[PDB]
Structure 1
Amino acid sequence: ANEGDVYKCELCGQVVKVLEEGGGTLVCCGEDMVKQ
């Protein structure tokens, strides 16, 4: 994901902002978080 990017969990509605970018895929509730 990228810096400044905002991700959401469609299962629980948790939302995060990417502060430091890295090559891993962000996961929550065992599903891929969705880029906003």
Structure 2
Amino acid sequence: ANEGDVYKCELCGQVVKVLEEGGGTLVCCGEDMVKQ
């Protein structure tokens, strides 16, 4: 992900920001959050 990017889910509907990108995935609710 790109720094300053926001990610939201479609299930849980959780929204978080990407303060610091990493070589991993942002899982959520036995799923994988979405990116805006």
Q: Same fold (TM over 0.5)?
A: yes
* Overall identity of the aligned pairs, in %: 100
How large is the Cα RMSD of the aligned pairs?
A: 0.8
Number of positions where the alignment pairs a residue of Structure 1 with one of Structure 2: 36
Unmatched 5+ residue regions in structure 2? none
Find runs of 4+ consecutive structure 1 residues off by over 3 angstroms: none
Unmatched 5+ residue regions in structure 1? none
Using the size of structure 2 for normalisation, the TM-score is: 0.82
